[PDB]
Design a protein around this ligand. Structure first.
Ligand code: CL
Length: 300
């Protein structure tokens, strides 16, 4: 019939990074194809990769921005998805920016190494998010549980900057690309520093949790600061085999065609290239996406 294909893209809170990225994708789609009256794209602002992946599982959402941790678990039916069927029909459209496990304190705090966060007021993020998974794994490695902290706050990126500078939390924890506006806000409001992860912790995390890569947040992004050793994951745009070859192709092509605008959406995307988009190490690439990346030589 003459109805447009209605595409819904899971993102996150309007205060976050995913929301404007997804909004931009819908705009690229409208600009490239809107006049042909076959496609209409919308975003969802509900937070969390669990929500988004469940919405995809139940066929009420087509595509979502997620990150590697919950992508890995959903695809494999492991960990938090232990009791569910693997989402074996999940497919990647494009890898996006890296997100780094980022631990931030006031310089005035006593805190210098990871073991100093024990006993403090710390953020563990909202349920169903990459931050929550990272914190559960980190506590896991250290053998720590709720009794070992005075406060386990459940704040989003923006909320943490203010909470940290007001001393309502001692340790901001996020899994985010850099440079990031919330960290910038924090550093403009009080004097902050980053806590690195030690070699053994990074090695153990990468060994146990294949979605975490050993990585470095380069120094000097927000103030005078050193390189910070930590782990990273990737944000990615995922879908399922229910999305047609044609739409997967068209969507990836629209993003690639508008890459220079995408780079401008947030600081962490400035370096993104088509070669970066074409990588997928957890979920198979959608056939229609692969068609595009091969056509332009982003994959050999
Ligand atoms: Cl999330």
């Amino acid at each position: 019939s003459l109805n447009r294909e209605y595409i819904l893209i899971g993102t996150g809170s309007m205060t976050g990074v995913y929301y404007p990225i997804g909004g931009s994708i819908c705009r690229f789609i409208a600009s490239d194809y809107g006049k042909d009256n076959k496609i209409i794209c919308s975003i969802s602002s509900t937070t969390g990769s669990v929500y988004n992946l469940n919405s995809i599982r139940y066929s009420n959402m087509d595509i979502s921005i997620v990150q590697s941790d919950l992508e890995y678990y959903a695809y494999n039916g492991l960990g938090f998805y232990e009791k569910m069927l693997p989402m074996d029909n999940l497919r990647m459209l494009a890898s996006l920016h890296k997100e780094y496990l980022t631990i931030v304190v006031k310089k005035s705090s006593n805190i210098s190494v990871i073991d100093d966060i024990k006993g403090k007021r710390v953020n563990i993020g909202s349920p169903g998010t990459g931050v929550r998974v990272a914190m559960l794994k980190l506590l896991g490695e250290k053998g720590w549980t709720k009794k070992d902290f005075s406060v386990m706050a459940e704040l989003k990126s923006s909320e943490q900057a203010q909470a940290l500078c007001d001393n309502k939390i001692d340790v901001m924890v996020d899994v985010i690309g850099h440079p990031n506006a919330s960290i910038q806000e924090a550093s403009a409001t009080c004097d902050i520093k980053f806590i690195p992860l030690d070699d053994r912790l990074i090695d153990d995390l990468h060994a146990k949790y294949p979605y975490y890569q050993k990585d470095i947040i380069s120094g000097g992004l927000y103030n005078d600061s050193p390189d910070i050793q930590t782990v990273s994951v990737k944000a990615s745009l995922v879908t399922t085999t229910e999305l047609s070859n044609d739409l997967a192709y068209k969507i990836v092509k629209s993003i690639a065609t508008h890459l220079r605008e995408l780079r401008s959406i947030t600081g962490a995307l400035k370096t993104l290239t088509v070669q970066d988009m074409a990588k997928s190490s957890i979920t198979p690439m959608h056939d229609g996406a692969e068609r595009y990346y091969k056509e332009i030589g982003a994959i050999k």
